[PDB]
């Protein structure tokens, strides 16, 4: 997984390119920590009333949006996603004193004040409270606070994932892969996830030096990413990347294909790029493809791009990207592949407009006065 | 009682906005009449420790659960959550848990949205012990009719005037929302207490006169962002969608929470952007809203920053602002109704101002069994 040279000279490009290698590094770390993790988590997961909340701010909030439903379904446990920004402003709406809680806290720096504030609020509100921070900065407040507790097991990501770029890349993907591997090791582990790393390395290789812009370049003023279920979380992250790296010059939006029909589709104009992240689950994929057919037929957008594992007549009919050949991926695995395109697209839009992509607040109030 | 002023735009949307306070009290007084039937249906369900309660709808109807599910969860201590029908239909396996009983609260104006009916069928297919409470505006719709035809269901019909003729839902959404709150939290939200909300929203509408001033005005903004904390983010989302719908996309619209806004999305603020902040009435929560407002005011980069709040303060008064009519203290789910009055009427007048016709400004269902 050796990265090619970062010809743009940005940290962001380096951080995109070092992702496949970072992912496998993280999962081999989890293998080394597996007994310790099981000894911490197994007694918790045996509590039938356990709530597990995945929490982060900004990009870190989207990890939960992508994986929490899959984890709930897969494990049969009570996994949900609540951003740290909602926990901090409205703790009473989300923290239930009547059940035990395991709070999975994500942080690239670990220094957003909301990260430690949410942990403290959880401890205040929930009598039987446990923590698994997953973080990229050993020196961060979030990790430092956790080592200073006995209800916490903090998991450090590989050092290179402490992204220096303003926009998170390897931090989000590595934390997401790590969370998946912690709770679903039978499915996502240091062996199976090599297929995901290999395919994402192939995606990056397929894009060469990135100079052709991934989706190209055009005077679009609006971008919309669409994905079903948890892939909507990937669409949200993809939109935020565009927005951050273009300093808001390109307006960005996200939705699910089916949700998009209920009003939001009015945003599509002849200066709009629409990108569809097509599900690999055939039942779900039908809905993605029906919407793709509609968007192609509508003739409103500047460009409609389908990104899919499988080529089909509607996918191939207009602008499209077929993922490199691989085994069947489930949608949480596909999320990594889609993000490779969205990250690289956003980087190159930023550069093309002459921006500096690496460089393109909150006061915590106590619950008790 | 709550008699609307004349709808001088000649639009169904204006008529539907103005008849909201009256419709709310009509619905809650109906619930009073149905209370003992409701209680007979619901009390045995709510006694089930492991019950999941899902609030579901599409589009605007999805945002009801976004506004009220967390409050309902915390207020009642029951397992309330919101999942849009659009997610239930595409990814049922990710949301419908066969191991627990389910009560599905289905919102639908027509009751005929293919996704509404599909979500009901999928919930029945996936969840062995499944119950339904559709809240709907159409007596002849599938949601209502299927429910009354089955023993696992109890359907609640909204007042007839709330079957909105306008493309953009107004009285349908607010009346369904008030009804849902009244069903599950009648000790707090009821045909008595909610009269203060209807009264205040009637005062808001009166304060806007014939609406010709356009509410926030007619400046040449190109982007609008609504911000609200917690469940008010759902109100912000509905507010954004109304603008987008009624202007046929011409005004780009965004939503977020005040604290969420700092982590990237703030980059969207430019000198053609209007930012509207729905300030919490909760004394903890509002501190965060006001710190963010202060930051946006200090930045001075938006075309306009408008705070809407129950109480003025230096921060709120240091730029464009609207203070709500005087009333008793409202909780945030009550406030949502007040904020929506401004958002709906703003969107309607933006639409008309640009020469659009606001009243008039699809999905295939596939079987889970292939």
Swiss-Prot record, chain A:
Top-level enzyme category: hydrolase
Superkingdom of this protein's organism: Bacteria
The entry's keywords: Hydrolase, Repeat
Presence of the UniProt keyword Nuclease in the record: no
Gene3D superfamilies: Glucose-6-phosphate isomerase like protein, domain 1
Classification via Pfam families: SIS
Chain ranges of the SIS domain: 41-193, 211-360
Catalytic activity line of the entry: D-galactosamine 6-phosphate + H2O = D-tagatopyranose 1-phosphate + NH4(+)
One Gene Ontology biological process: carbohydrate derivative metabolic process
InterPro entries assigned to the protein according to its UniProt record, in alphabetical order: GatZ_KbaZ_carbometab, GlmS/AgaS_SIS, SIS_AgaS, SIS_dom, SIS_dom_sf, Sugar_isomerase_AgaS
Listed SUPFAM superfamilies: SIS domain
CDD domains: SIS_AgaS_like (cd05010), SIS_GlmS_GlmD_1 (cd05008)
GO cellular component terms given for this protein: plasma membrane
Enzyme Commission code(s) on record: 3.5.99.-
Molecular functions per Gene Ontology: carbohydrate derivative binding; hydrolase activity; isomerase activity
Keyword presence, Repeat: yes
Annotated function: Catalyzes the isomerization-deamination of galactosamine 6-phosphate to form tagatofuranose 6-phosphate and ammonium ion.
Family: Belongs to the SIS family. AgaS subfamily.
Protein's name according to its UniProt entry: Putative D-galactosamine-6-phosphate deaminase AgaS
